[PDB]
Amino acid sequence: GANKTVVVTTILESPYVMMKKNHEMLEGNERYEGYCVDLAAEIAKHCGFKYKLTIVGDGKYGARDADTKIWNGMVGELVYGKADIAIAPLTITLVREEVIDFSKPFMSLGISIMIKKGTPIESAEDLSKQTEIAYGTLDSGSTKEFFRRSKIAVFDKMWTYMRSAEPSVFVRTTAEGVARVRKSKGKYAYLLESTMNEYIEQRKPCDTMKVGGNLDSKGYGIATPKGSSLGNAVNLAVLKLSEQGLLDKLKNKWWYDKGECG
Amino acid sequence: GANKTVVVTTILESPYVMMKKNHEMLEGNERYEGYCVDLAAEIAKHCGFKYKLTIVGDGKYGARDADTKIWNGMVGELVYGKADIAIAPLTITLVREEVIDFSKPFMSLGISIMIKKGTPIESAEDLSKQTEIAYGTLDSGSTKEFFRRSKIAVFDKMWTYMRSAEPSVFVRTTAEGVARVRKSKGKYAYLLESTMNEYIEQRKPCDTMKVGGNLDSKGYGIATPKGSSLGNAVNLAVLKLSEQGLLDKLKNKWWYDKGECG
Ligand SMILES: N[C@@H](CCC(=O)O)C(=O)O
Ligand SMILES: N[C@@H](CCC(=O)O)C(=O)O
Ligand SMILES: [Br-]
Ligand SMILES: [Br-]
């Protein structure tokens, strides 16, 4: 069959995908910049396809409704055939691996704690043993599922608190979670992946920090519909780009070369 | 077809696979202990197979002879059908992914530098810009291939030195490389994966240390022959064990609960 345009689903998540400054006057793929935008171009080059970047319609990574069993987010766009590939900071998880294909990981990370500077919190155990400082996670993502499923004493205690906290401690986007840390004068801490935490730590106004070690160890992968013929070539491209040092170069470009806090 | 015993290829590499103290009086799988021995039992349980642990015949991880194109080590045992699965600290690489199947990674790591304490070396750049202190890597492994293929200025310079150094700076086993660091009074440094470096740093006589950051970022995966029906179930088992915290528990058990340097 003749080549067709590969539909790429992704998510507005800094520094992976961001609107360029002049984006209102730009169109198509040129509206966007970031780590995943650069990565998409590299994957397309090595695999030999043309592509269109599209921002996921519901703004979500992907979770399965416990009642209706329907997948939302970027995972849903792959499951229902609305996109051909997802190039995003999409965490490789068991429940997702059962319904979509993943490349080997292009980035390693773990769940981490973001505080406003000066907050008297050093660890998840600290958060779990107090109630003055609220804390939460992103909706429809792997971090929330981590706490929902954990049998580790500290993390189960944190989940029991978060699921019933009022007002809600869950946010719709990472940016909302970060904004809540910044505006809460230290009374809200945010549970997010170390990649995004470390990025924000280097962005103005330089008022947040990552505390403690990571709570787990996992990776982001490029996702394709289960059984898609594109997955094999995409996986080999990730491995080649990793071994050539390109992924390290892109991490340095978007996290630290552009750091704003010194 | 009726179930048959799964032949597991692995390698004597501490703390992944080690001879038990009384091993001369033990037989079968009971001769061995370590992270990979525990992991094998967990994978077998979740996938529902019986298995026999076998130590790779040539003691190697796996490389392809540039002339004869033949694979040695554990990769060769899978390629030629002498083993059904490899449960070992086997690095996921492009050239291996082309000939065998890999699970998603069960451990993350990077290449690192081991010195005898007091050696005046802090980085790969330091090693590359001097000649008093020799340095080398393991034969037939992914670290040697890393330096052989690198186009990064510092690492290419190090390869050009290592490939022609006399006497040879390459070793046959990790243990030989560690012993050479310890006996060379600081005149040999060893390039090895951070996992093994960090383990040795916590073992008697506590005379080595890991210096500098990791040179790359990658992972170990469970390997199966290409197209093997076992790979799918093995991959889901790794992800479940990761998410249940078992891999973290096993890392703590074999690296740090058993640390000997404080
Ligand atoms: N990377 C996560 C989203 C962010 C988070 O959950 O912290 C996912 O794929 O669901
Ligand atoms: N894990 C490596 C062996 C150790 C090394 O090369 O440093 C491999 O799979 O080849
Ligand atoms: Br992973
Ligand atoms: Br990997």
Swiss-Prot record, chains A, B:
Detected in forebrain. Detected in dendrites of neuronal cells. Expressed in the pyramidal cell layers of CA1 and CA3 and in the granule cell layer of the dentate gyrus. The keyword Methyltransferase does not apply. L-glutamate binds at residues 89, 91, 96, 142-143, 193. GO terms for molecular function: AMPA glutamate receptor activity; amyloid-beta binding; cytoskeletal protein binding; extracellular ligand-gated monoatomic ion channel activity; extracellularly glutamate-gated ion channel activity; glutamate receptor binding; glutamate-gated calcium ion channel activity; glutamate-gated receptor activity. The record marks 64, 148, 240 as: Interaction with the cone snail toxin Con-ikot-ikot. The record marks 121 as: Crucial to convey clamshell closure to channel opening. Keywords: Cell membrane, Disulfide bond, Glycoprotein, Ion channel, Ion transport, Ligand-gated ion channel, Lipoprotein, Membrane, Palmitate, Phosphoprotein, Postsynaptic cell membrane, Receptor, Signal, Synapse, Transmembrane, Transmembrane helix, Transport, Ubl conjugation. One of its GO terms (biological process) is regulation of long-term synaptic depression. Residues 120-262 are extracellular. The modification Phosphoserine is found at residues 150, 184. It is found in: Cell membrane; Postsynaptic cell membrane; Postsynaptic density membrane. Coiled coil: none annotated. Induction: Down-regulated in the pyramidal cell layer of CA1 in the hippocampus by global ischemia. The M4 transmembrane segment mediates tetramerization and is required for cell surface expression. Homotetramer or heterotetramer of pore-forming glutamate receptor subunits. Tetramers may be formed by the dimerization of dimers. May interact with MPP4. Forms a ternary complex with GRIP1 and CSPG4. Interacts with ATAD1 in an ATP-dependent manner. ATAD1-catalyzed ATP hydrolysis disrupts binding to ATAD1 and to GRIP1 and leads to AMPAR complex disassembly. Interacts with GRIP2. Interacts with GRIP1. Interacts with NSF via its C-terminus. Interacts with CACNG2, PICK1 and GRIP2. Interacts with GRIA1 and SYNDIG1. Part of a complex containing GRIA2, NSF and NAPA and/or NAPB. Belongs to the glutamate-gated ion channel (TC 1.A.10.1) family. GRIA2 subfamily. Ionotropic glutamate receptor that functions as a ligand-gated cation channel, gated by L-glutamate and glutamatergic agonists such as alpha-amino-3-hydroxy-5-methyl-4-isoxazolepropionic acid (AMPA), quisqualic acid, and kainic acid. L-glutamate acts as an excitatory neurotransmitter at many synapses in the central nervous system and plays an important role in fast excitatory synaptic transmission. This is Glutamate receptor 2. It comes from Rattus norvegicus (Rat). The gene is Gria2. The chain holds residues 413 to 795 of 883 of the full protein.
